[PDB]
């Protein structure tokens, strides 16, 4: 009821020379003024300031009070107008550009009509439960910037409410575009409430985890009714998207019998246990229409789970995995008939040569719905470094069109990630996501690389650091060998020294040619 | 003359449950017995021990004494037989399978005739100067395991002989297949001597660095003669390969005028400065034949430099870069006419969509000579994390056929890497190289992933750690939350806890189905 919340390091400490800014735009139908966040990096030497994306949200807000309910007037006005369904897809299909769509368009530097079109056709989603009034809207889709999710949450073995709220603020400081609260320990409802009220980014959950808690860990005591009540509980708090493993069908379970690592999905294994116990079809599949009815009233997006994802290179792209993908497509099309926003969850552990098949089949079988991958990890050999093994896969599958990359931290396979691991995972995934944006030739993505590289060539060291994903790491690393203030304007570093610095030699070469 | 050498952590500390082993094979022409190293990971639960590659070399050897001269009898016998040229390519073209070829074949689990064929056709090299008698032979080529190079060496600003020798032993402990001594500071000759006498892996250099030192940093005072004397000096010590920027032609230099980051190659910028000073063709290009004559007498392989590699995403795949690549192909074919072993150096900073063009053009224009890339870095945005930005590129270009991946450490663009950075870079690159082996479906590569994943599924925690690239990191990370001995056999970790562990649920599912 009153956790001992501690503040994360300030925006200014994390991003020296940056300021938080907002672009003001007017939603013309309503007259509502939207303040769309961005981060301005102030540079030297006559360079214009560099504007970048900003997920960090409002700063220095007491977590006991929570964030401003910025969407309140939007939601209240739409309610007063009256509507049969509350989803961004419903509105988009009516030809309506909502505040959320305009906010996202502004944030992406794209046309609001283009945003509306992408949402209406099911190729992008704006996860934005009407009860998450604190949310700064964002969009997930192949035509937009590649996004990153940070998974947090406690377990029965580790962590606390205070630490999980810290982790959400911290994850978003470093660039997480969404978070999920995957708590499987104590105080699931309360932890999630504190997170939602203090999160400017979309928050996802996997409702089956709490449903299993509601029945004291006895999977056989799950059923639709327990699950339904969990969905409503979570929707009422403002959860923006639910992972639901409705594609783990009874008949697909035996396809996993010869796998090396079996069913590694937590939710998938829970559904599989129930299905086998009763020899009955997955209750989330059976009640898909009823789930859609809930989602329509709040705008909860559905992230259709991949409970049969491969958990080892050995199992990659096997029959079980693709059987579920086929069903994910069926469920996607059914959700769209009710105007429910959908993305599809994907692998997993997948060696690089098997990555293209994953994207090809998803794009076709799921009608281009946004894809949301866990990595993939490209090799199993390096626990402790699975942020790297998976950054390779995530960058690759992102380049092929994957819209949301679920991070993997250095603690993958080993233990619950702490705040440091969360940062490491977010950084690795921001690298993968941006590398993918470059590969897709996404408009203006290279401007960031160019600004940093120009600062590098010109020996504007502080500008170089300020422009990077993690300024203080770059600065500290440089300063381990050359800490003096004068070195911040030196035309070399300790790698080559003054006489061998190649950019300084180029500098002399060009001066001589002048 | 007598540095204060300090020992690296022991093999046993780095690789718990592993032993160093050797496979004995007989070179039939000579009767020489070869002892080819490997590392055996001892496992539990009736698993056979897992045998892996091992670059760590002989352990606990006093650096003041140096390693055993294991190749002495091979070299002495060939000298007594008499030969006009001393290169592995010369021998291969005569139809001779040398000790080096058999050693490599054994190490790669491939046929010695296949090794001979690959070397004869120029598609693989065995860098193995006859004066590097301490060397455990290895092969670089697309048909073999993807290899990793670690760059070390001092600068005028940082490090020492003791620290550089430590770094070579340390780099190879973690998996470096070759190293380069890139020293640009004090005691270049001595540093390199200590390294060669204590390195079981091939050692490369960039001779122009020391040549520039010989003329007191005045590039205009370089010339062929200075360079020639440097080549002979380094060859006499046992350097296995030379990076020579002979493709930086006078007429290519103006192609860099509009680049964002100019010429980032150290050697390339030195050659460019000289060429512009005199308006004369690159002296290494002009004297290519004379360089080949030197290489033939020692078996120094040539790593044809890419002095015009791109140093920013902006500059990737530009005219300057590919002009040099075309010349690298000419130089390659010329070297082969004299039976000199060659690889080609490649980029650089290259966004992912531009990676395939790099491989396509190199394979064609350079007649499938082994390619040796620096990364590539797939984005410029994350100094401090360029081992990750480049692991993505290295894995990708490795998958397309690149044979040797030059590492990039977290200190790239920032300062001279220390011993910790060397480890981080090697690990990241071993991940990239192995991920590439998997993508190429290289024989038996997946056995490693499978063994670790089997240990993971079966909760053989110590086996899992022992099988990984960095066992103590994995173990320590797990133990941050579950340090008790009993947790090493627990069917969960702190990520999910006992009630939500998906592999344990799969375990129950399969037991129930039994
Ligand atoms: N993104 C993704 C793809 N596959 C799984 N996930 C993520 O993994 C979690 C669900 O895990 P599980 O399937 O193991 O219950 C959620 O964070 C979900 O988005
Ligand atoms: N592998 C590679 C590809 N391009 C450059 N390198 C490596 O970078 C160094 C040469 O650097 P430079 O060209 O800057 O003189 C040597 O380690 C060389 O193998
Ligand atoms: C299913 C994906 O989410 C990760 N995962 C599961 N639970 C948590 C948690 N509480 N915090 C962080 N990551 C988690 C898994 O390790 C896998 O990557
Ligand atoms: C040319 C490539 O080698 C790296 N490099 C240059 N000199 C050294 C050194 N002494 N030690 C380690 N890496 C070095 C550069 O940073 C680049 O990655
Ligand atoms: C549910 S925790 C374990 C998740 C597993 N590492 C995976 O690959 O999905
Ligand atoms: C010579 S030190 C700088 C090297 C540079 N970072 C490159 O991309 O090659
Ligand atoms: S010294 Fe080498 S690493 Fe440092 S700025 Fe110059 S070119 Fe870059
Ligand atoms: S608890 Fe989750 S992360 Fe840990 S071993 Fe089980 S499946 Fe893996
Ligand atoms: Cl696991
Ligand atoms: Cl640099
Ligand atoms: Fe996994
Ligand atoms: Fe660089």
Swiss-Prot record, chains A, B:
- The answer on whether this UniProt entry bears the keyword Acetylation reads no
Principal location: plastid
EC primary class: lyase
Positions annotated to bind Zn(2+): 349, 413
> Quick one: a GO cellular component term?
chloroplast
Q: Which residues bind [4Fe-4S] cluster?
A: 493, 496, 501
The alphabetized UniProt keywords are: 4Fe-4S, Chloroplast, Iron, Iron-sulfur, Lyase, Metal-binding, Plastid, S-adenosyl-L-methionine, Thiamine biosynthesis, Transit peptide, Zinc
Q: How is the cofactor bound?
A: Binds 1 [4Fe-4S] cluster per subunit. The cluster is coordinated with 3 cysteines and an exchangeable S-adenosyl-L-methionine.
Where in the cell?
Plastid, Chloroplast stroma
One MF term from GO for this chain?
protein domain specific binding
Q: Among the record's GO biological process terms, what is one?
A: thiamine diphosphate biosynthetic process
Q: In which tissues is it expressed?
A: Strongly expressed in cotyledons, leaves, flowers and siliques, and, to a lower extent, in roots. Expressed in all green tissues, but not in roots, seeds, and petals.
Q: Which reaction does it catalyse?
A: 5-amino-1-(5-phospho-beta-D-ribosyl)imidazole + S-adenosyl-L-methionine = 4-amino-2-methyl-5-(phosphooxymethyl)pyrimidine + CO + 5'-deoxyadenosine + formate + L-methionine + 3 H(+)
Name the phenotypic consequences of knocking out this gene: Albino (white leaves) and lethal under normal culture conditions, probably due to an impairment in thiamine biosynthesis.
Task: Give the pathway annotation.
Answer: Cofactor biosynthesis; thiamine diphosphate biosynthesis
Q: Which family does it belong to?
A: Belongs to the ThiC family.
What is this protein's record name? Phosphomethylpyrimidine synthase, chloroplastic
Gene it is expressed from = THIC
Full protein stretch here: 78 to 591 of 644
């Amino acid at each position: 009821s009153s956790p001992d919340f501690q503040p994360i390091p300030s925006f200014e400490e994390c991003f020296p020379k940056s300021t938080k800014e907002h672009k003001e735009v007017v939603h013309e139908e309503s007259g509502h003024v939207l303040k769309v966040p961005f981060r301005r990096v102030h540079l030297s030497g006559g360079e214009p300031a560099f504007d970048n994306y900003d997920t960090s949200g409002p700063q220095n807000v007491n977590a006991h009070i929570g964030l401003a309910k910025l969407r309140k007037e939007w939601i209240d006005r739409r309610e007063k107008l009256g509507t049969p369904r509350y989803t961004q897809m419903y509105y988009a299909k009516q030809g309506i550009i909502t505040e959320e769509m305009l906010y996202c368009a502004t944030r992406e530097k794209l046309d609001p009509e283009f945003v509306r079109s992408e949402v209406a056709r099911g190729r992008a989603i704006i996860p934005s439960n009407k009860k998450h009034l604190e949310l700064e809207p964002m969009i997930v889709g192949r035509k937009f910037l590649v996004k990153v999710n940070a998974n947090i949450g406690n377990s029965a073995v580790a962590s606390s409410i205070e630490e999980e709220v810290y982790k959400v603020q911290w994850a978003t400081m470093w660039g997480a575009d969404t978070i999920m609260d995957l708590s499987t320990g104590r105080h699931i409802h309360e932890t999630r409430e504190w997170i939602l009220r203090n999160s400017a980014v979309p928050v996802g959950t996997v409702p089956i985890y709490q449903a299993l808690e509601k029945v004291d860990g006895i999977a056989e005591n799950l059923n639709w009714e327990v699950f339904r009540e969990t969905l409503i509980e979570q929707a009422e708090q403002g959860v923006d998207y639910f992972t639901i493993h409705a594609g783990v069908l009874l008949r697909y379970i035996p396809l996993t019998a010869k796998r090396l690592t079996g069913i590694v999905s937590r939710g998938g294994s829970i559904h599989a246990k129930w299905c086998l116990a009763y020899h009955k079809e997955n209750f989330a599949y059976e009640h898909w229409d009823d789930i859609l009815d809930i989602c329509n009233q709040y705008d909860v997006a559905l992230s259709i789970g991949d409970g049969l994802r491969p958990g080892s290179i050995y199992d990659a792209n096997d029959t079980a995995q693709f059987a579920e993908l086929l069903t994910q497509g069926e469920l996607t099309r059914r959700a769209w008939e009710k105007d429910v926003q959908v993305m599809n969850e994907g692998p997993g552990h997948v060696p690089m040569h098997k990555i293209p098949e994953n994207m090809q089949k998803q794009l076709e079988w799921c009608n281009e719905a946004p894809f949301y991958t866990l990595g993939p990890l490209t090799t199993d050999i390096a626990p402790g470094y699975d942020h790297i093994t998976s950054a390779i896969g995530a960058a690759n599958i992102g380049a092929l069109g994957t819209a949301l990359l679920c991070y993997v931290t250095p603690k993958e396979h080993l233990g619950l990630p702490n705040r440091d691991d969360v940062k490491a995972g977010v950084i690795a995934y921001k690298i993968a996501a941006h590398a993918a944006d470059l590969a897709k030739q996404h408009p203006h993505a290279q401007a960031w690389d160019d600004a940093l590289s120009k600062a590098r060539f010109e020996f504007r060291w502080m500008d170089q650091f300020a422009l990077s994903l993690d300024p203080m790491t770059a600065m500290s690393f440089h300063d381990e060998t050359l800490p003096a203030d004068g070195a911040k304007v030196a035309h070399f570093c300790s790698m080559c020294g003054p006489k061998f610095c190649s950019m300084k030699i180029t500098e002399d070469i060009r001066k001589y040619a002048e």
